Every structure is written in C-alpha cells, then in structure tokens.
Amino acid sequence: LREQSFDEAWLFHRGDIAEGEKQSLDDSQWRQINLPHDWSIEDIPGTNSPFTAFTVGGTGWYRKHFYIDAAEKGKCIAVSFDGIYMNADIWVNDRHVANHVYGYTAFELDITDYVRFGAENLIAVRVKNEGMNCRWYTGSGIYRHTFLKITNPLHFETWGTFVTTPVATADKAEVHVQSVLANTEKVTGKVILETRIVDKNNHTVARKEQLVTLDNKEKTEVGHALEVLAPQLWSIDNPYLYQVVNRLLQDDKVIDEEYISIGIRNIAFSAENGFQLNGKSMKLKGGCIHHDNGLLGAKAFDRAEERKIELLKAAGFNALRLSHNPPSIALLNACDRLGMLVIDEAFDMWRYGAQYFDKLWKEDLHSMVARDRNHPSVIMWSIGNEIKNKETAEIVDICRELTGFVKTLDTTRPVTAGVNSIVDATDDFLAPLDVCGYNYCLNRYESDAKRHPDRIIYASESYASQAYDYWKGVEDHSWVIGDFIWTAFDYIGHANCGDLNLSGERRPQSYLRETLWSDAPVSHIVVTPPVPSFPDFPDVVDHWNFPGYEGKKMTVSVYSNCEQVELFLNGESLGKQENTADKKNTLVWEVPYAHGILKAVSYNKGGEVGTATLESAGKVEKIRLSADRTEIVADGNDLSYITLELVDSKGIRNQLAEELVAFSIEGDATIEGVGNANPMSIESFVANSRKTWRGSNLLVVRSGKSSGRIIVTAKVKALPVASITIT
C-alpha cells in the first residue's frame, strides 16, 4: 500500500512530560485515541467546561507504536500530517526529526533513516499551542488526517504533479500533466512515464506514454499533454470529476503510481465580463468560513467537512472564502465533488502580531499552493487578510514577494487578498493582485472603477445587516464579481454572525439572503422577541410562542422577493403590502400576539405564488430524534449527526424548551460530541449530557470498527425515553 491512514491507535498525554519522546518511557496508562483529535474542545482538566472564566491550549504529547515490514527495507518511508496546531516537534525512535510551526499547513517527514525494518517503531509528537487565540478558536493537537507513505527510491515527488487544462471547451480539452520525479540515489536510467485519464466510471479516455532518461540531478522534471474528446466540464451544477493515473514503469514493472482527481473547466476574470465559468458569466454567491466544526472543535473528520459543504450548498452558496488559512484536504475534496468554488487563503496578518513570518512564509505558502493547486474547486489564491500599514512601501513589497511566489507554482488562477479601509493610496498594494477583495467597502465599487477600469472587485467580507445593498452592488456592476458574507457558518470565538448557526441550521439572515439569490419565489416569517435574546443582524426569532404577551403588539417581519405579501393571524388579514425597493425585501406588520397561525401569502403579477406559515408550538410532549444518515461505515471514523428536538403533539419544535438531555449509546460506537446553538453557552462539548436551546440540540456519533447496530438513547425529565437506531 503506497499511502495508508496513520490515524489509528495513538496515545495522548495532556501537558508537558519529561522524556515524552523516549522509547523507555512507560506510556501504558496514556489515553488511547484515534486521530483526528483536538484537546482544547475537551474540558479543561479539573473543571467541566472547555472555556475559562476563552479556551486553553498549552502543551500536549502524542505517541504511536507502529510496525514496518522487513520487506519494505530499501524503500522510502514518510509520515505526513495535514495539520498540527501548532509548533510541533517530532521524534522517531528517540531521534529528533523535525519542527513545524504553522498550525494550518500540511507537511511530510522523511523518516527512512530513523526506522527499523521488521520491528516496532515509536513516533512521538510534542504540540505547543501558546498563542492568545482571541479572534477565533484554533483547537490544539493533531486535528487532521495523517498518512504513512512507502515508495521506491524513484518515485513521484509529493505535490510535484500539477495537472492543468489550458484548453477546455465543449468539443475537447487539453490536459497538461507536469511531474517531478524524486530520483533519490541520482540513479541513471530510462523510465516510462505512463499517463492515463479515466472518467467517473474509471473508463480510460486518454492515455500517453513518454520515455524519460533520468537527469543526473536529484529531481527530474517531466510533462506532456493529453486530449479528452467531448469532456464533461466541471461546474457548480455538474461537478464532474476525472482521475489522472500516473505510473512510472521499469522493465514492464510499476515502480510508483499516483491518482489525482481533476475537474476540467475554464475560469476567466475581467472587469468587463466579471467571473466566467466555462464561458458563462456568473456572480459568486459567497460566504466566509473558519475551520472549526463547532461541537467537534478543530477535528476535521471527512464527514464533518463534507456535511458543512452540503449544508452550505443547500442554503444556496456557490463559493466559499476559507478565512484565513488553508483548510483540510477533506474540505477541498468535498468542494470538488459537490460543486463549490473556493478562495484558498494562506495567511491572516503578515508581520503585525507573527514572530516567524519572515523565516517561514515561503514554506507555508508553498505548502498551500503545491498541496491544493489540482482542486478544480479552487479559483483564487488569497495571500492575506486585512494587512496593517498596507500603504507603506515595505508592506507593498511584501505583497509583491508573496504574489510572485504563488506564481512560481501556479499561474492558472488569480492572486487576491482581503483588504479593508481602502483609500486612493492603497493603489500600489492592490496593483500586484489579479482580483481585489474589498472588506466592507461597497462605497468604493464605482469610484475605484472610474480610477482603474481594469480593476476587478469582490466583497471579500460583507455585513449581514447590509445584505441587500451589498448584493445590489454585485448585480449592478460587471467588475464586481460576487460577495462573501461574514460568515456563512457560525464559529467558536461565540461569533453569532453566521448564516448557519453552530449546529448547521439556517438563521434568519440566511432567509433574507435567499431572497436576494433565489430564482424562485421566497418568503419567510420571523418575529422580534419582546425582550432581547442576549443581554450585526437584527434580533429576530422564527417562532410564535410569546406566553404572557397576549394582545401586545409584536413586530412580525416577512423577508420576500415577491411583489406583494399579505399577512394573516389565525385567518384574519393584517393587510397586503407592496414589496417596494425601499423595503429591502423586508415587510413589517405590528401584530397583537395570539397563539395560533401566522400565514403570509405572496403574489407575483397579481397571482398567488406561495404560502408561508409560522405556528405556535403546543406544550412539549416528546423528544424527536433524527439522524442525517442512518447508515454509516464501520471504519472508526465515519459520523452520524443526530438532531434532537423537543416537540408538541403535532411535531412542532417548542423553542421555549431548554432542558437537560442525558444521552447514552449501545453498540460499537462512541459519542464524539454534544452541542447546541446557544452562543453564550459554556457547556461541555465532550460530555454525555447537554441542554437543549430553543428546543433543540445536536449529538455526533463516531462509528466503531465492527458492524452491527448502534442505539442512541435520549432522556429528558417528564418525557418518554426516546431512542434511534443507526447501522
């Protein structure tokens, strides 16, 4: 096996410890874990909360005993980490291998000279997360996948194969494959580079052979182009993937082999036609996301990342900005497969705290671009966010250095950055960029276009409370190619400004945004609560349960893209209104509260086009459980997300209900996390109990290794026990 998950059967110790790296150390009582892991989402030891009176990093240690076959003697051995947060040191059999500082970039260690073949080996990792971490939650530990790579001395260099499509039309595509052969021993020879392109059913659609004489130098560059007839072009609506299969052959034997998933698509950016995908002009319907997965902390489980992309796709996003660091591989793979465009971002700030930027930026920028440049979802490289002193010549020169560095590795996508507080004197900082991200700067879209008719703009951050005006600024200007809400998904560090909350549910600002984006009729009813929800988008809720306020006027709002909307309470008309431009898709009624049914009837062209309702919940009568997937893979890493709701006799969630739920599990599986969407909660995420908030909470089950059924049970005072079966 050329590449194998290394995630299973690690040992973990929280805190520093003497001789943490030594084979002689007694690690028999260390915690047994399977990666990915994040110790900062676990309770701070000696308390029952991961938050202090706001999370804790510090030092922790990981250890793993692993067998390497005697038959692998002579081959190259490597361990790769897609991310460790942060400042990690690695030893193999007591010997220091490497230090790695940046917590968001992947790296690979050659451990060939440290291992013993035919026997048990030890790897140890010390992790030190000593930063302040106050704008967003980072996590601590080995929070992404790890792999063990075994190759012949002559092999494809990791990330050295770059696949491009310089011609990509409905009739044909040209696929260029450029590779770097790691020729360890500088061995001369004539190898065969065989390239095959397979469609989604693994059918060969192109195949090309090249005889390569090995240059004496330690690396030999090789490349050739292949043609694909009648290609299925990758797009948002049709995210068709091919695979490139590269083999090195010697004497009719396979010396190495690699697989690269690709999408064949043309991307083009201009002030005059904006962003074009496969020649079709379109706006980026975007949002920013941070890397945590809420109740899972930083743990980048494949299913967590894939679910996040699915939920954002279902809400209507077609583009994400990965603020402000490279994501996991699994997230980019999900974007490729589900059809989501990506701005991949290397850094937050450059020098303004940090300490390591000047020595390490090249290694970490290389890591992002070399790792990610084959993903068809990636459309732009962001080199930084809200850089301080960006008008000073010294900072402009840094922007230029980084921009050129990206281009040593990829010229097929624009370089960009997210830029706040733009003035005329920001021109020199923006000039090296191909496309300019404006953070909250709608007021300059036209004036800057007058001054620089070739400048291309998108809102790299916009405010939810200004959604309508910011999106009108996209619609009216060909050179403004889209807009990225801060944020598409709530994150820890909590923020409470997400279109989707920490549990993945759509919030009221998502409804409003849907009225900007949807090609279909849309209306959603929300209500201003009479006392503020918390001690930025308006405070509105999506329920009609206001006991004690009978007869008092509630502000009911309807977000709509329709021409007219009529609101009714319990069948009685409260008046029909015109959705004129000044209302910014938000119609308002004052409604004396009465339990029952709010109904909004929408009209286009004088004709009813839809009905929306919001109905008061009765008293809670049962727990309802639902799993997003009731069948999961018994590999110890797949997840099921189980949403719990407290509901009345008709199945309506009662959003006044805030009760403690005791969870338990039978079968070969674990409770990996519990959570709710309360942004002020300091409850534990890694416990077996959790309160509901607005009638709901969330549980994640992680599969075990054996097959069989898994029963999750939930218990709440006064209610029948509820349970759900996963297989």
Side-chain angles (χ1 to χ4, degrees), residues 1-53 55-119 121-184 188-189 191-214 219-251 254-351 353-354 356-358 360-727:
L1 262 188
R2 184 188 192 264
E3 278 191 27
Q4 149 184 339
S5 175
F6 203 55
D7 287 339
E8 195 171 317
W10 283 76
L11 299 169
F12 171 78
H13 177 276
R14 185 176 187 143
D16 209 358
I17 186 183
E19 304 204 328
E21 84 277 1
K22 304 225 141 184
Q23 299 172 78
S24 54
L25 175 93
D26 182 4
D27 64 18
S28 63
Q29 286 191 20
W30 288 35
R31 275 180 61 197
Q32 291 172 31
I33 61 167
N34 296 315
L35 305 185
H37 178 243
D38 167 15
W39 77 74
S40 297
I41 210 61
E42 294 170 345
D43 288 351
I44 294 157
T47 86
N48 63 352
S49 180
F51 304 100
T52 49
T55 65
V56 164
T59 294
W61 282 83
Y62 295 83
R63 278 167 71 100
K64 170 162 181 175
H65 303 273
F66 62 104
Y67 189 82
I68 304 295
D69 282 351
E72 315 303 352
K73 191 159 189 208
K75 299 205 184 55
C76 301
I77 317 282
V79 177
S80 66
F81 298 92
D82 196 42
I84 307 176
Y85 204 95
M86 57 171 282
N87 196 1
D89 284 286
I90 295 85
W91 301 251
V92 169
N93 298 322
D94 299 18
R95 297 173 48 200
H96 194 254
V97 175
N99 174 82
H100 190 267
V101 177
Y102 197 43
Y104 298 113
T105 43
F107 58 103
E108 184 180 286
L109 306 183
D110 182 357
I111 65 166
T112 308
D113 298 337
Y114 303 83
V115 300
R116 60 186 76 160
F117 296 92
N121 297 257
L122 166 76
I123 186 173
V125 182
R126 185 182 59 195
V127 184
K128 296 208 247 63
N129 182 10
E130 270 114 74
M132 185 177 306
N133 298 161
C134 89
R135 281 200 60 156
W136 71 89
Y137 176 84
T138 67
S140 306
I142 311 182
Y143 68 104
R144 286 171 183 171
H145 289 310
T146 66
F147 298 96
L148 184 69
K149 298 188 169 191
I150 298 172
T151 65
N152 289 322
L154 173 55
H155 56 94
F156 292 107
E157 192 186 48
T158 297
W159 303 340
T161 297
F162 183 19
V163 177
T164 50
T165 64
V167 171
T169 66
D171 262 345
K172 66 195 75 170
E174 167 184 314
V175 174
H176 194 91
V177 179
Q178 183 81 21
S179 291
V180 185
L181 312 189
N183 181 4
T184 272
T188 70
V191 290
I192 294 294
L193 164 68
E194 176 197 43
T195 300
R196 173 184 310 265
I197 305 182
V198 298
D199 68 12
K200 85 182 217 80
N201 299 111
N202 228 250
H203 172 68
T204 296
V205 295
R207 190 191 160 283
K208 186 137 169 180
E209 230 178 278
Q210 187 177 337
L211 176 62
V212 166
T213 63
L214 289 184
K219 300 179 186 193
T220 300
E221 257 158 11
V222 301
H224 48 192
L226 293 89
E227 188 184 46
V228 177
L229 216 51
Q232 309 310 113
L233 302 178
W234 188 96
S235 81
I236 297 312
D237 294 331
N238 185 31
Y240 194 102
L241 298 172
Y242 290 82
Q243 273 186 333
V244 177
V245 180
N246 264 353
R247 300 195 314 170
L248 296 175
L249 307 174
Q250 255 172 353
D251 313 326
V254 180
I255 305 300
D256 196 25
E257 177 173 49
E258 68 181 347
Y259 296 79
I260 311 181
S261 173
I262 63 163
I264 300 173
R265 84 284 186 267
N266 193 83
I267 60 165
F269 301 79
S270 60
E272 304 74 11
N273 294 111
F275 171 65
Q276 290 167 303
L277 171 65
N278 300 323
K280 305 289 201 179
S281 290
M282 57 171 348
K283 304 300 194 173
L284 304 171
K285 295 179 166 163
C288 299
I289 53 162
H290 271 299
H291 71 290
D292 79 63
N293 286 306
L295 80 181
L296 303 177
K299 289 178 292 220
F301 288 104
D302 289 345
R303 173 61 189 156
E305 309 282 72
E306 168 185 78
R307 174 185 177 265
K308 181 183 297 180
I309 300 319
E310 286 173 351
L311 294 169
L312 292 164
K313 266 290 274 210
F317 293 94
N318 69 19
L320 300 175
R321 180 174 177 242
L322 309 184
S323 44
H324 301 295
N325 52 268
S328 74
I329 302 292
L331 191 102
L332 293 174
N333 289 342
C335 286
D336 294 344
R337 294 190 306 274
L338 294 165
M340 175 81 81
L341 303 165
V342 168
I343 296 171
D344 202 355
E345 189 152 68
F347 301 115
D348 182 27
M349 300 285 207
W350 291 344
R351 283 176 181 169
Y356 312 85
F357 181 83
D358 295 323
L360 309 183
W361 66 266
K362 269 199 244 193
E363 275 200 358
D364 295 313
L365 191 42
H366 174 274
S367 171
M368 171 182 76
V369 177
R371 188 190 69 168
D372 293 348
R373 54 184 178 176
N374 289 326
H375 291 286
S377 56
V378 174
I379 62 170
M380 299 187 238
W381 300 113
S382 188
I383 55 166
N385 176 64
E386 290 195 355
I387 304 311
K388 269 210 220 310
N389 300 312
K390 56 188 151 295
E391 292 78 24
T392 72
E394 170 194 49
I395 304 314
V396 167
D397 278 342
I398 291 178
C399 180
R400 289 161 39 84
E401 270 244 76
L402 273 53
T403 292
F405 187 76
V406 172
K407 283 170 174 166
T408 61
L409 296 167
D410 182 15
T411 56
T412 70
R413 303 169 173 88
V415 176
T416 189
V419 189
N420 53 332
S421 314
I422 297 167
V423 294
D424 288 10
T426 315
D427 281 356
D428 290 352
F429 179 91
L430 296 166
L433 304 182
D434 303 297
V435 180
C436 304
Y438 279 27
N439 281 3
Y440 320 105
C441 214
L442 163 69
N443 288 347
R444 289 184 68 103
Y445 292 179
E446 309 192 54
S447 60
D448 276 338
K450 253 91 165 44
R451 280 165 52 77
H452 302 285
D454 302 311
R455 184 177 292 174
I456 310 170
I457 299 163
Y458 62 104
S460 38
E461 298 181 14
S462 68
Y463 302 118
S465 62
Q466 298 171 337
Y468 182 102
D469 291 341
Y470 268 68
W471 191 253
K472 181 167 153 47
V474 176
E475 290 178 328
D476 299 352
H477 306 110
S478 66
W479 63 91
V480 177
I481 66 175
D483 175 292
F484 289 75
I485 167 73
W486 188 263
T487 53
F489 209 117
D490 259 57
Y491 57 95
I492 302 165
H494 43 263
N496 193 70
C497 34
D499 273 25
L500 278 61
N501 64 22
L502 205 76
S503 300
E505 314 169 275
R506 282 177 80 205
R507 289 184 68 235
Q509 70 192 55
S510 178
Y511 303 159
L512 173 69
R513 184 168 310 282
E514 185 182 359
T515 72
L516 309 172
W517 285 354
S518 176
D519 303 303
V522 178
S523 301
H524 292 286
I525 305 158
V526 293
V527 189
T528 296
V531 299
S533 300
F534 311 103
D536 42 324
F537 200 75
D539 175 11
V540 297
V541 300
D542 65 342
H543 68 76
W544 193 231
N545 282 86
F546 294 103
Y549 291 92
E550 292 75 4
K552 301 305 165 50
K553 282 180 271 220
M554 316 283 309
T555 305
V556 176
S557 303
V558 184
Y559 306 133
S560 188
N561 57 9
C562 297
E563 298 188 350
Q564 305 158 292
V565 179
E566 186 170 8
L567 192 61
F568 303 76
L569 175 60
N570 294 329
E572 181 199 295
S573 176
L574 307 166
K576 177 179 285 180
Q577 293 187 47
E578 300 293 320
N579 186 13
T580 44
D582 61 304
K583 295 188 165 127
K584 300 182 189 198
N585 287 359
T586 304
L587 306 106
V588 185
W589 291 255
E590 298 298 328
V591 185
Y593 177 66
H595 188 106
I597 293 186
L598 283 166
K599 188 177 68 174
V601 177
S602 300
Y603 297 80
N604 281 326
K605 303 291 309 300
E608 177 181 333
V609 300
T611 291
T613 57
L614 185 62
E615 176 174 3
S616 311
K619 68 171 202 213
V620 175
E621 266 181 43
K622 51 204 175 121
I623 302 168
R624 189 230 219 183
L625 298 166
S626 66
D628 70 340
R629 290 162 59 237
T630 54
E631 303 175 327
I632 66 187
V633 181
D635 61 11
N637 292 283
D638 195 3
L639 311 172
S640 178
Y641 279 70
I642 293 174
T643 292
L644 172 156
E645 297 176 280
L646 298 186
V647 301
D648 69 6
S649 61
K650 295 182 302 199
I652 299 186
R653 183 181 309 183
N654 186 312
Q655 299 195 34
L656 311 179
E658 303 195 348
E659 304 296 336
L660 183 65
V661 180
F663 294 106
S664 50
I665 193 163
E666 318 166 48
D668 186 20
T670 49
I671 302 178
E672 187 64 24
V674 289
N676 56 41
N678 181 1
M680 311 289 102
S681 181
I682 48 143
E683 296 170 84
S684 169
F685 290 116
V686 175
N688 294 321
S689 63
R690 183 79 189 202
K691 291 203 306 164
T692 62
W693 184 76
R694 301 201 180 159
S696 193
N697 63 11
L698 184 62
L699 182 148
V700 177
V701 170
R702 186 180 179 164
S703 64
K705 296 279 200 316
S706 73
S707 213
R709 53 216 290 267
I710 300 161
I711 302 194
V712 167
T713 296
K715 306 184 179 191
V716 173
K717 279 197 189 328
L719 304 180
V721 185
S723 74
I724 184 174
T725 290
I726 303 314
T727 49

Short mmCIF file of all heavy atoms in Angstrom, two decimals, residues 89-109:
data_model
loop_
_atom_site.label_atom_id
_atom_site.label_comp_id
_atom_site.label_asym_id
_atom_site.label_seq_id
_atom_site.Cartn_x
_atom_site.Cartn_y
_atom_site.Cartn_z
N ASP A 89 7.02 19.26 17.40
CA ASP A 89 8.33 18.63 17.29
C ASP A 89 8.11 17.13 17.25
O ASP A 89 7.29 16.60 18.01
CB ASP A 89 9.26 19.00 18.44
CG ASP A 89 9.83 20.40 18.29
OD1 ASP A 89 10.71 20.59 17.43
OD2 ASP A 89 9.35 21.31 18.99
N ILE A 90 8.82 16.47 16.34
CA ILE A 90 8.61 15.05 16.06
C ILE A 90 9.92 14.32 16.30
O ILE A 90 10.97 14.75 15.82
CB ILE A 90 8.12 14.81 14.61
CG1 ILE A 90 6.73 15.41 14.36
CG2 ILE A 90 7.99 13.35 14.36
CD1 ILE A 90 6.78 16.88 13.98
N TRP A 91 9.85 13.23 17.06
CA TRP A 91 10.94 12.29 17.20
C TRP A 91 10.50 10.93 16.70
O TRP A 91 9.34 10.53 16.87
CB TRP A 91 11.41 12.13 18.67
CG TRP A 91 11.91 13.35 19.38
CD1 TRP A 91 13.21 13.64 19.73
CD2 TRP A 91 11.11 14.42 19.89
NE1 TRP A 91 13.26 14.81 20.41
CE2 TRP A 91 11.99 15.32 20.52
CE3 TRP A 91 9.74 14.71 19.86
CZ2 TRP A 91 11.55 16.50 21.10
CZ3 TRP A 91 9.31 15.86 20.44
CH2 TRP A 91 10.21 16.75 21.06
N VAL A 92 11.44 10.19 16.12
CA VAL A 92 11.23 8.80 15.74
C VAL A 92 12.33 7.98 16.38
O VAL A 92 13.52 8.26 16.17
CB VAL A 92 11.21 8.64 14.22
CG1 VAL A 92 11.26 7.19 13.83
CG2 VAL A 92 9.90 9.35 13.65
N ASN A 93 11.95 7.01 17.21
CA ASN A 93 12.87 6.20 18.00
C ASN A 93 13.91 7.06 18.73
O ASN A 93 15.10 6.90 18.56
CB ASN A 93 13.53 5.16 17.08
CG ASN A 93 12.49 4.20 16.49
OD1 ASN A 93 11.55 3.82 17.17
ND2 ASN A 93 12.66 3.83 15.22
N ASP A 94 13.40 8.01 19.54
CA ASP A 94 14.17 8.96 20.36
C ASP A 94 14.91 10.07 19.60
O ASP A 94 15.43 10.99 20.23
CB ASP A 94 15.21 8.22 21.25
CG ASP A 94 14.56 7.25 22.23
OD1 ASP A 94 13.40 6.88 22.01
OD2 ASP A 94 15.20 6.86 23.22
N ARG A 95 14.96 10.02 18.26
CA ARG A 95 15.75 10.99 17.50
C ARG A 95 14.87 12.11 16.92
O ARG A 95 13.85 11.85 16.27
CB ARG A 95 16.52 10.27 16.39
CG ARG A 95 17.52 9.30 16.96
CD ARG A 95 18.19 8.44 15.89
NE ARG A 95 18.66 9.26 14.77
CZ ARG A 95 18.94 8.79 13.56
NH1 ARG A 95 18.79 7.49 13.29
NH2 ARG A 95 19.36 9.63 12.61
N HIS A 96 15.27 13.35 17.16
CA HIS A 96 14.54 14.48 16.63
C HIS A 96 14.52 14.44 15.10
O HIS A 96 15.56 14.30 14.44
CB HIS A 96 15.12 15.80 17.10
CG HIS A 96 14.20 16.96 16.85
ND1 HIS A 96 14.43 17.89 15.86
CD2 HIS A 96 13.01 17.29 17.41
CE1 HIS A 96 13.45 18.77 15.86
NE2 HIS A 96 12.57 18.43 16.79
N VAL A 97 13.33 14.53 14.52
CA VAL A 97 13.20 14.53 13.07
C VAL A 97 13.02 15.94 12.53
O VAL A 97 13.73 16.35 11.60
CB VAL A 97 12.03 13.62 12.63
CG1 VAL A 97 11.84 13.73 11.12
CG2 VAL A 97 12.28 12.19 13.05
N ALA A 98 12.07 16.69 13.09
CA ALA A 98 11.63 17.96 12.51
C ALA A 98 10.84 18.77 13.52
O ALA A 98 10.22 18.23 14.44
CB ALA A 98 10.75 17.77 11.27
N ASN A 99 10.84 20.07 13.28
CA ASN A 99 9.97 21.03 13.94
C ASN A 99 9.08 21.62 12.87
O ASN A 99 9.54 21.87 11.76
CB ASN A 99 10.81 22.13 14.60
CG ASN A 99 9.97 23.22 15.18
OD1 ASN A 99 9.44 23.09 16.29
ND2 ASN A 99 9.80 24.29 14.42
N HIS A 100 7.80 21.84 13.20
CA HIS A 100 6.90 22.52 12.27
C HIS A 100 6.04 23.56 13.01
O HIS A 100 5.35 23.21 13.97
CB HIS A 100 6.00 21.49 11.55
CG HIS A 100 5.23 22.09 10.42
ND1 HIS A 100 3.94 22.59 10.58
CD2 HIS A 100 5.57 22.31 9.12
CE1 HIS A 100 3.52 23.07 9.42
NE2 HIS A 100 4.48 22.90 8.52
N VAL A 101 6.06 24.82 12.56
CA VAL A 101 5.43 25.88 13.36
C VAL A 101 3.98 26.15 12.97
O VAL A 101 3.09 26.08 13.84
CB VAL A 101 6.24 27.19 13.32
CG1 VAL A 101 5.48 28.27 14.12
CG2 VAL A 101 7.66 26.96 13.91
N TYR A 102 3.70 26.42 11.69
CA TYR A 102 2.36 26.93 11.33
C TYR A 102 1.27 25.88 11.53
O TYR A 102 1.37 24.75 11.03
CB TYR A 102 2.34 27.39 9.87
CG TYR A 102 1.17 28.31 9.46
CD1 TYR A 102 0.74 29.36 10.27
CD2 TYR A 102 0.53 28.13 8.24
CE1 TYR A 102 -0.31 30.22 9.85
CE2 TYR A 102 -0.46 28.99 7.81
CZ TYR A 102 -0.89 30.02 8.60
OH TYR A 102 -1.89 30.88 8.13
N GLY A 103 0.20 26.26 12.20
CA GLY A 103 -0.75 25.21 12.54
C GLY A 103 -1.75 24.80 11.48
O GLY A 103 -2.55 23.89 11.74
N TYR A 104 -1.77 25.43 10.31
CA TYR A 104 -2.77 25.17 9.28
C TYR A 104 -2.18 24.56 8.01
O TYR A 104 -2.94 24.32 7.06
CB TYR A 104 -3.50 26.48 8.88
CG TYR A 104 -4.25 27.12 10.02
CD1 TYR A 104 -3.85 28.34 10.55
CD2 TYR A 104 -5.31 26.47 10.59
CE1 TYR A 104 -4.52 28.91 11.57
CE2 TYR A 104 -6.03 27.06 11.65
CZ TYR A 104 -5.61 28.25 12.14
OH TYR A 104 -6.27 28.84 13.18
N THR A 105 -0.87 24.35 7.93
CA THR A 105 -0.33 23.76 6.69
C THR A 105 0.12 22.31 6.86
O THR A 105 0.61 21.92 7.92
CB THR A 105 0.84 24.60 6.16
OG1 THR A 105 1.70 24.99 7.25
CG2 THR A 105 0.31 25.85 5.48
N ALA A 106 -0.03 21.54 5.77
CA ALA A 106 0.38 20.13 5.73
C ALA A 106 1.87 20.03 5.46
O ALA A 106 2.47 20.91 4.83
CB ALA A 106 -0.36 19.39 4.61
N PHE A 107 2.47 18.95 5.94
CA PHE A 107 3.87 18.70 5.73
C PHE A 107 4.11 17.20 5.80
O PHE A 107 3.29 16.42 6.31
CB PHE A 107 4.74 19.42 6.75
CG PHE A 107 4.44 19.06 8.20
CD1 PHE A 107 5.27 18.21 8.89
CD2 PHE A 107 3.37 19.63 8.86
CE1 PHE A 107 5.02 17.88 10.22
CE2 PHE A 107 3.10 19.30 10.21
CZ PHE A 107 3.92 18.44 10.88
N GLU A 108 5.26 16.81 5.26
CA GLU A 108 5.66 15.42 5.12
C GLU A 108 7.07 15.25 5.67
O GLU A 108 7.97 16.00 5.30
CB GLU A 108 5.65 14.98 3.67
CG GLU A 108 5.98 13.50 3.46
CD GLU A 108 5.94 13.11 2.00
OE1 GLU A 108 4.82 12.99 1.46
OE2 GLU A 108 7.02 12.95 1.37
N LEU A 109 7.28 14.23 6.50
CA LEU A 109 8.59 13.95 7.07
C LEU A 109 9.15 12.68 6.45
O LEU A 109 8.47 11.66 6.43
CB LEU A 109 8.52 13.79 8.58
CG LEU A 109 7.86 14.98 9.28
CD1 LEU A 109 7.88 14.80 10.79
CD2 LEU A 109 8.57 16.24 8.87
#
